[PDB]
Amino acid sequence: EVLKPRTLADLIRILHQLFAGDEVNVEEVQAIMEAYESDPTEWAMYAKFDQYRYTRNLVDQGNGKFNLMILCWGEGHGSSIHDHTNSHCFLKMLQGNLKETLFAWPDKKSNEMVKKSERVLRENQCAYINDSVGLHRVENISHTEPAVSLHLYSPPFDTCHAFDQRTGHKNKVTMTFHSKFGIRTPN
Ligand SMILES: [Fe+2]
């Protein structure tokens, strides 16, 4: 009975409705994002890759309620261990596979960080995280194929923290966009 978007445009339209109000049903959003069947013809214009690290490509600003973006992971590309600045964060696979490792939060004492969960996100799967769930790292499982993911963050945010797996120490990071609406940013 899950509402199934037939196109990415459909999905965006639904998301505008689901985030219009004050409450967001996380499980409902997750199921509808998962139900969209990734179609590369519909998102190729956002899939702009870089040789050395993943790229963040803005798709939609959600009437200020969320950022919707596509992240392009080249061969072997991965993220830092990071938090999500008190937002809801949905991650759906569009191509390939990402390994998600969930980490416990450090305390002030320096220590090796503790893994709480490790999984591979399957085709079209939508995962969910917020700061109460934990920290995470995501990485392309493949050194021969890319991965592409669709991220919805609500409310939008432009900074987070990256964490050193050896110590738990963190640094603030300002996130930048490689492209917006299919158009490369100045860089
Ligand atoms: Fe993340």
Q: How far, in Å, is the centroid of ligand 1 from the Cα of 104?
A: 14
Domain boundaries along the sequence of the chain: 1-187
The answer to whether the CB of 163 falls within 8 A of the CB of 135 is yes
Tell me which fold the domain 1-187 belongs to: Jelly Rolls (2.60.120)
d(CA 125, CA 122): 5
**Residues forming beta bridges with residue 71, ordered by sequence position:** 56, 149
> At what resolution in Å was this solved?
1.8
Is 88 annotated as a binding-site member?
no
Strands (E), the chain: 55-60, 67-73, 81-82, 88-95, 98-103, 115-120, 126-129, 135-140, 147-154, 159-163, 170-174, 179-180, 183-184
Is 82 annotated as a binding-site member?
yes
Q: How far, in Å, is the centroid of ligand 1 from the Cα of 137?
A: 7
Q: How far, in Å, is the centroid of ligand 1 from the Cα of 83?
A: 7
d(CA 81, CA 119): 15
Where do the H-state alpha helices sit in the chain? 8-18, 26-35, 40-43
Q: How far, in Å, is the centroid of ligand 1 from the Cα of 154?
A: 12
